[PDB]
């Protein structure tokens with residue numbers, strides 16, 4: 001009856017729980033209106049997309065609330081997507097039930113056959129993408145993962161996407177060397193704060209996109225051996241979960257100067273080594289450095305325009321390798 005698109009935990013009979021950016025619930029209903037009850041651990045933001053039209057977003061902040069998603073529609077069958085805009089670090093969310101007024105739930109859409117997993121950091125979270133000032137610091141309201149390069153690429157390809165991304169995370173270090181779990185430590189989890197492990201058999205993508213290393217080179221440059229080994233470890237893990245996946249290793253568009261040259265050198269070394277070792281389904285993609293001609297979001301993170309450029313590039317790369325025309 002309902003599609004739960006993402007890494008969801010179903011252990012609580014009161015309602016499915018999720019954390020990662022871009023987690024979304026998708027359903028068909030008959031009627032004129034729809035409501036949902038949401039519990040949120042922090043300041044999470046959502047958007048309802050109803051018959052293909054995105055509605056003004058709303059937050060549910062460290063509380064449980066019943067929210068009217070849409071109303072006053074022509075009575076009939078409608079398609080609804082409820083999208084978690086904000087990232088896992090802003091808290092787990094539990095969906096406690098829908099209400100359709102005098103209407104009803106209808107058969108759910110067929111799940112998409114094409115599947116992508118994205119693994120990344122602030123760029124894939126779409127940190128700050130609805131801010132237009134690079135001087136402004138992070139606000140949850142301005143983080144719109146629906147307009148991340150990852151979400152846009154998935155819609156371009158008629159694919160579902162799981163967005164396994166955490167702002168500031170790296171392969172060898174987090175932003176500014178702040179201590180914390182690194183990507184390989186969070187990657188195994190459905191709910192990374194509470195230790196609920198993800199069962200990798202539940203979602204086997206044909207494509208994995210990795211965009212990591214910005215935090216490894218934006219302040220103090222990571223050690224080459226350490227970084228290359230860490231990146232290889234991650235690819236090994238992805239390959240062990242998904243023997244048949246095409247893996248796209250991506251650099252850009254936030255790195256600049258020497259940090260960008262070193263990151264490019266190290267990641268292309270990783271890809272070339274995987275290829276020589278016999279894995280021909282590991283590829284490299286570079287998003288050209290943002291130069292200001294497409295503006296900036298909060299803390300210099302990519303604008304929606306820059307996300308759109310990335311999505312055009314990445315869509316064409318995946319179409320090429322997969323034949324996903």
Ligand SMILES: OC[C@H]1O[C@@H](O[C@H]2[C@H](O)[C@@H](O)[C@H](O[C@H]3[C@H](O)[C@@H](O)[C@H](O[C@H]4[C@H](O)[C@@H](O)[C@H](O[C@H]5[C@H](O)[C@@H](O)[C@H](O)O[C@@H]5CO)O[C@@H]4CO)O[C@@H]3CO)O[C@@H]2CO)[C@H](O)[C@@H](O)[C@@H]1O
Pocket residue numbers: 089122127138167168169174175218253254255256257290291292299300
């Ligand atoms: O609060 C939520 C979340 O925060 C995480 O930490 C955030 C941190 O709070 C931010 O301050 C930080 O922002 C920095 C970016 O990561 C970093 O990439 C960016 O670096 C700039 C650089 O400052 C700037 O000089 C550079 O300019 C270049 C131009 O882009 C080029 O065109 C030109 O040729 O060259 C110049 C430089 O010569 O641009 C780059 C980016 O392109 O600076 C930001 C700070 O100013 O981001 C962190 C990670 O998201 C924290 O980790 C979380 O735990 C926390 O929840």
